[PDB]
Design a protein around this ligand. Structure first.
Ligand code: 0G6
Ligand code: NAG
Ligand code: CA
Ligand code: MG
Lengths: 256, 32
RNA sequence: GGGAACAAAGCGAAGCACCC
């Protein structure tokens, strides 16, 4: 996260860290959507152009964390993965269209002060809140600067930034990459003066909105891609969770 | 499900608000 | 009118080929 700040304790209790067993390293963000389902970006798990193709046994999820690196005794919980499901039309070749994946945990996590699932939006909630000019919130342990080896550009603790949703034609004109109806973008315009963006390391993390209708937090987006981080005239791109909710539900209804 | 989703034990459940959620709520004032 | 359309191909402060 570029130009964000330190999260408060328990601010984002649905935040999940995806962690490589060997070498031991942070891979990506993710989000907790029930006691045994975790949502993330497909490119965190499968991206052949970088020879990336993880299996269940390559990975842990770490839930309830605040520090990037410290083992948080009696706070964080670690789960193994039972199965990974990649969206069947995930387009890694072109533009990361449908950059979304589900991971089923081997056993359920217990909820706590620091661990709690986020809501997924119904049609009315999505139609109401997913509007240009409305702000949501992005969280992650990814890079602090566009320019992961470099320890000055790695956060000590979870980072948070609030960002406005951007009109679709502005998103489209900002980049030569093809934007699909399964994406949206967010970020301040250069004329708005304020700054902030997701960055490398933040993929899979949630873009969330607090509903003014029932005071609940909904995940509208998954950090998916960009070009550099926090450049004037560039915006972060996010997988459109509501648009692919039928798939999410299909997997969960079918696979236990 | 998901019964009790989206309500943070250390914030909504204690009627406490985090430092920047007001910025999100104010962004609804207009639109759209 | 209803279902489906694993939001598939498409179409702006994005909200509109299969079966009955
Ligand atoms: C995997 C995630 O950590 C990361 C998120 C980057 C978010 N950046 C901003 N500014 N919000 N995603 C990536 O690194 C993805 C995966 C593959 C390449 N990629 C990119 O973002 C490229 N920089 C651009 C791109 C190339 C090919 C296809 C789509 C986008
Ligand atoms: C990913 O890994 C599995 C083996 O674990 C392999 O069968 C599959 O074809 C791989 N997919 C790609 C696209 O590399
Ligand atoms: Ca920007
Ligand atoms: Mg489509």
């Amino acid at each position: 996260i570029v130009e964000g700040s330190d999260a408060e304790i328990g601010m984002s209790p649905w935040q999940v860290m995806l962690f490589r067993k060997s070498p031991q390293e942070l891979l990506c963000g993710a989000s907790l959507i029930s006691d045994r389902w975790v949502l993330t970006a497909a490119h965190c798990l499968l991206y052949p152009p970088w020879d990336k193709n993880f299996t269940e046994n390559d990975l842990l999820v770490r839930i309830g964390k605040h520090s990037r690196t410290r083992y948080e005794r009696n706070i964080e919980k670690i789960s193994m993965l039972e199965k990974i499901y990649i969206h069947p039309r995930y387009n890694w070749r072109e533009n990361l269209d449908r950059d979304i994946a589900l991971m089923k945990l081997k056993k359920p996590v217990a909820f706590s002060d620091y661990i709690h699932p986020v809501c997924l939006p119904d049609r009315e909630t999505a139609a109401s809140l997913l509007q240009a000019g409305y702000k949501g919130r992005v969280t992650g342990w990814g890079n602090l600067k566009e320019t992961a080896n470099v320890g000055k550009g790695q956060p000590s603790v979870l980072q948070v930034v609030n960002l406005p949703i951007v009109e679709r034609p502005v998103c489209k004109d900002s980049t030569r990459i093809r934007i699909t109806d399964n994406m949206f973008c967010a970020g301040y315009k250069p004329d708005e003066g304020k700054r902030g963006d997701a960055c490398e390391g933040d993929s899979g993390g949630p873009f969330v909105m607090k509903s003014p209708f029932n005071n609940r937090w909904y995940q509208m987006g998954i950090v998916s891609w960009g070009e550099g981080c926090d450049r004037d005239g560039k915006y972060g791109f996010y997988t459109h969770v509501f648009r692919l909710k039928k798939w999410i539900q299909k997997v969960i209804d079918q696979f236990g | 499900g998901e019964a009790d989703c989206g309500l943070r034990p250390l914030f909504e459940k204690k009627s406490l608000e985090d430092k920047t959620e007001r910025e999100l709520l104010e962004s609804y004032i207009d639109g759209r």
